[PDB]
């Protein structure tokens, strides 16, 4: 009664958004190395038992719609949901190739009242992206 | 009866708010490297917070930047876990 119930037909869906190339107008450079990330991640999460899907160079509308549709699917037989975002970003915001969109808007689709089949189930978001321009100088 | 709509979320950010996040073109981003490494060896036997805490430790210790630009030289990174979970999470058994 202290652990999430994992007794389901499926562990759950794992969506990977792998954004490497960006419209030059955004001023963002190609994110070299992100393919190795995406390759490493699908292998790991597949190994865990997730039904993994990889999307590449998504627009903001693509990302929004994609997560929206997934939230509208039937997760009744799934233990949990996972989403991994690999892109450029700034505080509270993430880059599509088309520009920026808020993290909150992407994840809000999976709120309890908006995705009832994932109610009382963990919703995991892993975010590889910058969150501003400060640097950490370290110590000792 | 009811449950909050914002409950049971977890966010594993690669870095703390306000900060950059580092990525090796050759080896991939630090955070993902560490996450995958630790999931490979403890994905099935550790709780999600234990996993991400070890990820925090590895990114913090094992990594340090090198640039010819001194402004970006020898800099560090710490990830950031936000948990609205109401239970412990194991991916097994």
């Amino acid at each position: 009664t202290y652990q999430y119930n994992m007794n389901f037909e499926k562990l759950g869906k794992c969506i990977i958004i792998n954004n490497k190339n960006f419209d030059k107008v955004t001023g963002m450079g190609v994110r070299n190395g992100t393919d190795k990330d995406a390759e490493a991640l699908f292998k790991c999460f597949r190994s865990l038992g997730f039904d993994v899907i990889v999307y590449n160079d998504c627009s903001c509308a693509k990302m929004q719609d994609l997560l929206k549709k997934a939230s509208e699917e039937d997760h009744t037989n799934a233990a949990c949901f996972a989403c991994i975002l690999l892109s450029h970003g700034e505080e509270n915001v993430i880059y599509g190739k088309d520009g920026v969109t808020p993290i909150k808007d992407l994840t809000a689709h999976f709120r309890g009242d908006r995705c009832k089949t994932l109610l009382e189930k963990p919703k995991l978001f892993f975010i590889q992206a910058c969150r501003g321009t400060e640097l950490d100088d370290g110590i000792q | 009866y009811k449950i909050p709509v914002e409950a049971d979320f977890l966010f594993a950010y690669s870095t703390v708010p306000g900060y950059y996040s580092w990525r090796s073109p050759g080896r991939g981003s630090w955070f993902v490297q560490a996450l995958c490494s630790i999931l490979e060896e403890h994905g099935k036997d550790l709780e999600i917070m234990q996993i991400l805490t070890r990820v925090n430790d590895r990114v913090a210790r094992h990594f340090e930047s090198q640039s010819d630009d001194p402004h970006f030289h020898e800099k560090k990174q710490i990830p950031c876990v936000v948990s609205m979970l109401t239970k412990e999470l194991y991916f097994s058994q």
Binding site: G29, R31, N32, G33, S87, H88, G89, Q128, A129, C130 | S14, Y20, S21, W22, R23, S24, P25, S29, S65, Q66, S67, F72
Partner: peptide, 4 residues
């Protein structure tokens, strides 16, 4: 190494 680069930044995101």
């Amino acid at each position: 190494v680069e930044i995101x």
